[PDB]
Each structure stands twice: as structure tokens, then as C-alpha cells.
């Protein structure tokens, strides 16, 4: 149905020294398609999905230059932010950038964003209207004043409603085999006794795409808010995703409990109960 | 595609 393109950026000052670690990655949906790493050999934007390889030399030169440019902006940033927060040069610091766009099921523009962090707390973020800024603290208000006079939002809105959206469609059409696929979750349930009167039922969902899934437990047709362990959705490393959800059950009453799986690759929601 | 505008020093 609805899609997204997203670019992620990390610069770490390694200092008393300098020369920062820069890594950039691009995703379409839950699939990585490009990367840059300053540590890596090539100093180029590199393909990380089959469908991006068909792009020409113009694209790779254009992305390399634009990614190299992001990096050197962030290097000046690291110098500047030390000054704005009176931090010394002995310690390591981190900037982070995220931008991208969402589209709906018709592939029309839904929402854009451009956010920025320093030392893992929010610094400055573009508001949903794409014409104004939320600045977190007082140093970020100085950045907000710079960016207001420089028309950064105007430029960002042009990218986020045009170029982001128009390239997302192109990526979705060139790799429609990969990107417009939905791997349904493959589900099972295991049973483990912890004592002589209690037992753990663990409901599994394996090899699904996209990563968005909802696992819920129900005792006699009613949502189990209580004793529910529920892990972080983890990757398999082949492109697909895994997740479980577990509950503790007083023994011999295991058949009272139902596991409910909703994911968009499924024709109907799934109901596993143990047996 | 990456942004070729709108990316400015803080």
C-alpha cells in the first residue's frame, strides 16, 4: 500500500585529533538500497540492492558528490556545535541527520520530514507543514535563525514534495519485483514448562516483509495486556524479518489462549492457538 | 535521490 524513501546520516568526531567517521545509508521502505562509508575503500556511493545498479554514471557521480558534500557540512557542524555548547576537544560527539518522504497507496505525497540531532537528543526538526522549525534548545534557535534567513525550508520543501516523491516512484517501478512484494509471516508456536503448574507459550512469526507486524495475545477472546513479553522486531539478514510474543499460562489451561497475527501480506488475520 | 539543496551548516 503506502511507501517511503529515507536517508540516514551519522558523523562521529573522533577527536583531540579530528577526521570524523561518516556513514550514510538510504532506504526505500524496509529495504536498504545505497550506502556511503568514509572508512570504506572506494569513497563512492555504493549499491546495496539489485535494482539500483541499472542507474548510469551520472547518478553515481551525483550521489557521491552530494553525499561527500553532506559529510563536509557535518564536519564544520561538529566544529561549530562544540562552540555553541562550550565543550572541549578531548571528547567524542555525534551528529545525526534524517530526511525523507512518505507516499500513500496512490503514490501521491503524504508527508515529509527533515530532522537533526546532536549527542543523541533532538536538535532541530522541520515541522509537518514544511515551512517552519521546531528548535529544541537555545543553541538550536541560533541555527533556526540562520536557516530561516537562508530559506532552508523552501529548498527542503521542493526536495520533499518533488524530488523525494518523484524518485521514490521511479525506485518503486524499477524494483517492483522486490519492493512491491509482501512476504507473509510464517507462523508457529512452541510450549515450555517453567514449573509444575505454569507454562510459557511463545507465538512466532518468521520471514516476513515489510517489518510492520502486530502480534497480540488473547485469553478467551480478550486482549492480554498483562503478562506479555514481546520482543523488538529483528531482521533475518536476508531481507526479511522476525518477531515473537510470549505469555505465562497456568498449566492444563493452555487452550484458553489465542495468538493473533496481523501483517499486510496475509489475506486474513491469523489465529494460532496451541492445541 | 539525495538532497542537492537545503543542506546547510548549523
Amino acid at each position, epitope marked *: 500500500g503506502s511507501h517511503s524513501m529515507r536517508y540516514f546520516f551519522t558523523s562521529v568526531s573522533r577527536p583531540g585529533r579530528g577526521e570524523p567517521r561518516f556513514i550514510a545509508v538510504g532506504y526505500v521502505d524496509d529495504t536498504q538500497f545505497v550506502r556511503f562509508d568514509s572508512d570504506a575503500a572506494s569513497q563512492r556511493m555504493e549499491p546495496r540492492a539489485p535494482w539500483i545498479e541499472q542507474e548510469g554514471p*551520472e547518478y553515481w557521480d551525483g550521489e557521491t*558528490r*552530494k553525499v561527500k558534500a553532506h559529510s*563536509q557540512t557535518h564536519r*564544520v557542524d561538529l566544529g561549530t556545535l562544540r562552540g555553541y555548547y562550550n565543550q572541549s576537544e578531548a571528547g567524542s560527539h555525534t551528529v545525526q541527520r534524517m530526511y525523507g518522504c512518505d507516499v500513500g497507496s496512490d503514490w501521491r505525497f503524504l508527508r515529509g520530514y527533515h530532522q537533526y540531532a546532536y549527542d543523541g537528543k533532538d536538535y532541530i526538526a522541520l515541522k509537518e507543514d514544511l515551512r517552519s522549525w521546531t528548535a529544541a534548545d537555545m543553541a538550536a534557535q541560533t541555527t533556526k535563525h540562520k536557516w530561516e534567513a537562508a530559506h532552508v525550508a523552501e529548498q527542503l520543501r*521542493a526536495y520533499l514534495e518533488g524530488t523525494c516523491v518523484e*524518485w521514490l516512484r521511479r525506485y518503486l517501478e524499477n524494483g517492483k519485483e522486490t519492493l512491491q512484494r509482501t512476504d507473509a509471516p510464517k507462523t508457529h508456536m512452541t510450549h515450555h514448562a517453567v514449573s509444575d503448574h505454569e507454562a510459557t507459550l511463545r507465538c512466532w512469526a518468521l520471514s516476513f516483509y515489510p517489518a510492520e507486524i502486530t502480534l497480540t495475545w488473547q485469553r478467551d477472546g480478550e486482549d492480554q495486556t498483562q503478562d506479555t513479553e514481546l520482543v523488538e522486531t529483528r531482521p533475518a539478514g536476508d531481507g526479511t524479518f522476525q518477531k515473537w510474543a510470549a505469555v505465562v499460562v497456568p498449566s492444563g489451561q493452555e487452550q484458553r489462549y489465542t495468538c493473533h497475527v496481523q501483517h499486510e501480506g496475509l489475506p486474513k488475520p491469523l489465529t494460532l492457538r496451541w492445541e | 535521490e539525495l538532497a542537492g539543496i537545503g*543542506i546547510l551548516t548549523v
Partner: T-cell receptor
Amino acid sequence: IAGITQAPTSQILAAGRRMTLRCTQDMRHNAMYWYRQDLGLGLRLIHYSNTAGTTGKGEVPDGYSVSRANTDDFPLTLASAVPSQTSVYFCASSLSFGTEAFFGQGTRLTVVE
Amino acid sequence: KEVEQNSGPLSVPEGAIASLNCTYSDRGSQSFFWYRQYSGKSPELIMFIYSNGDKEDGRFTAQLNKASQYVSLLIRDSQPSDSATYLCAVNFGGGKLIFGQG
């Protein structure tokens, strides 16, 4: 009033000499550029620089050196003076990469043998 | 790479509409610029355009068609002071800001 100046405005070089064209900018701009303009084929990018400290190569960097020690200065220097480098030279700058460029005065340069 | 302009010299009489086009080779170019340059002078900016479609400034209309790789400048009502070589500038990367032939 913040601007961009080039120096000198005109120069006659002997063949095999060295010449540095200065270009400075008050406007706190990150990105700076060097161009050559010739009678048939328009402006032509020699070198660029996206931020202070960093540089880059354009369409025709051959014969041309460049340096970015500070935000303000972007001097173009020519190591060997070939007769092919007779042009009008334009320094420029923009607030960040991909934005509107503001040009210097220009420099008429003629290398004679 | 290539930025090709509408091949001059054009000759448009007074009070009329002059029209210059610009084509570029990079599908992913995101910023586009029109400069005016008098005889032995610096280029100075007429307009920038980022988004697809029409931009208005006085006697000047910018038009951008990114799918067609097309920028144009329509000069309405042209004065004798509009006589200059007109320059188109397309940005190809970070600092790869590349120009037409004029």
C-alpha cells in the same frame, strides 16, 4: 556591505610562469567556485569547494591549483603558464552547495610566449 | 556533463517576447539558474527555480520541466538594456555547478 572581490583584474603572463589569482568573500558562504570563460564555449568549471577546508575538481582542472584554508579565501594558482590558459577567469560563491552563485569582478588573463 | 543552450545569436526586436531554452543531461539535477552577462562584465542572477512549473518575476517567467530536462526563460516586453548573452546553470552534484555555452 558584504561582497566578493577578485585580484588582479588583468594580467599578462610569460610562458612557464606562476600566477595566483586571489578571491575573497565576506558573506559567510560555504561553497566557492572557479570558472574560465572563452569566446565560444561559455563558462567552464575549473574547481569547487563545498565548505572551508575541502576542495574538488570540475570540468577542466588541468594546469590549475586550488586551496581553501579559510571560509573567506579561495585562491586559484597556475603552476605552468601554457598559452591555452588565455581566458577570462571568474570566482564565485554560494551559501551552500546547489544554491545561487554570486560572481566576482572577473580577471582577464593572457599568457604570451 | 552537458548543458546545451538555445543556440545564438538571437535577434528579437523591441517590445516583443524573447525566449531562451536550456537542456541538461542529469535526470537528478535539483537546482537551475538564469544569468545575464553584459559585454566584459560579471554574470548576475535573473532567477533560480527548484520546483516543476512556472515562476513569475516582473517581465520574466521561469519554466522548469524536470521530466523533459528543460529550463526556459521567457522575457516579456524586451528593452534595449536586455541585450546580453544569457547563461543557464544547472547543478550536477555538490559543487558541480555547470553552465551552458551562452
